[PDB]
Symmetry: C2
Subunit: 162 residues, 2 copies
């Protein structure tokens, strides 16, 4: 119940396609700190399933290489809230999106919401969106964030943001 | 170009005493992304000299312990800019301060200012000052920062902030 503003009326079909992890933030520094930190993941593809779930394709830097991971976000009552079981998290929350430009989401472990909160700013094109970053920074002030990372367009197009 | 509004009319004698590194930001992630990162330093005390220079007592995680380091900032013709050469930096810029609550400063290598820029938000007491942090983020809006770190009161009182 830390993250309160979830997008009421999210249409999961319109978020399908390619995305880029433009910026990310977390409540615990060490979970996002290093290149191989456990919550340092880069979203590639969001693909809703026929069952109404959401498949999240992301890359993660593991053992001196960029590894491909897939994680199923299963629907719940709340349209913008999904349940998962990867990265020691169990919930995906969509804060806001306009589908065409940007999407803001957070991940949480409901058992330890203050230490597991990690949020990201996704963008449709591999460029910096000042309007997406501003909406991203505005959502973070209400959240207990202690680390913020930003990436340039060149890194958005490299494997694991180089 | 990057650091614009260095402070006007700074009295270096009034910044004396203990400080705590409440938040920090760097232009490249790798400059701060770890405790052993080259620009991950925690200011403990500012000690102005009779010559008008500024001496910096800080902590740095070196060879598996929190080491004591000390930086003499030589005065220049402009009051809010000092010359150093430690941590591979050569310039200290005081952006703004109210002397008895907060102080914002940046360090740079003048040869490569965008590859070496690190800024910090210092506070007098080991407590979160959202109003000092807001001035810090406000001064950072003009800067090409890609990593931002902030710390809680318990971390402010520990060696190397954990």
């Amino acid at each position: 119940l830390i993250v309160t503003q979830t997008m009421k009326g999210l249409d999961i079909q319109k978020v399908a396609g390619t995305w880029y992890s433009l910026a990310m933030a977390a409540s615990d520094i060490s979970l996002l700190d290093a290149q191989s930190a456990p919550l340092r993941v880069y979203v590639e593809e969001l693909k809703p399933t026929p069952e109404g779930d959401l498949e999240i394709l992301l890359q993660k830097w593991e053992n001196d290489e960029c590894a491909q991971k897939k994680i199923i976000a299963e629907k719940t009552k709340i349209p913008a809230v999904f349940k998962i079981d990867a990265l020691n998290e169990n919930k995906v929350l969509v804060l806001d999106t306009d589908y065409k430009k940007y999407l803001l989401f957070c991940m949480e472990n409901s058992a330890e919401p203050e230490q597991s909160l990690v949020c990201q700013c996704l963008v449709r094109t591999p460029e910096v969106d000042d309007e997406a970053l501003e909406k991203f920074d505005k959502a973070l002030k209400a959240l207990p964030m202690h680390i913020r990372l930003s990436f340039n367009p060149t890194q958005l197009e490299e494997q694991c943001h180089i």
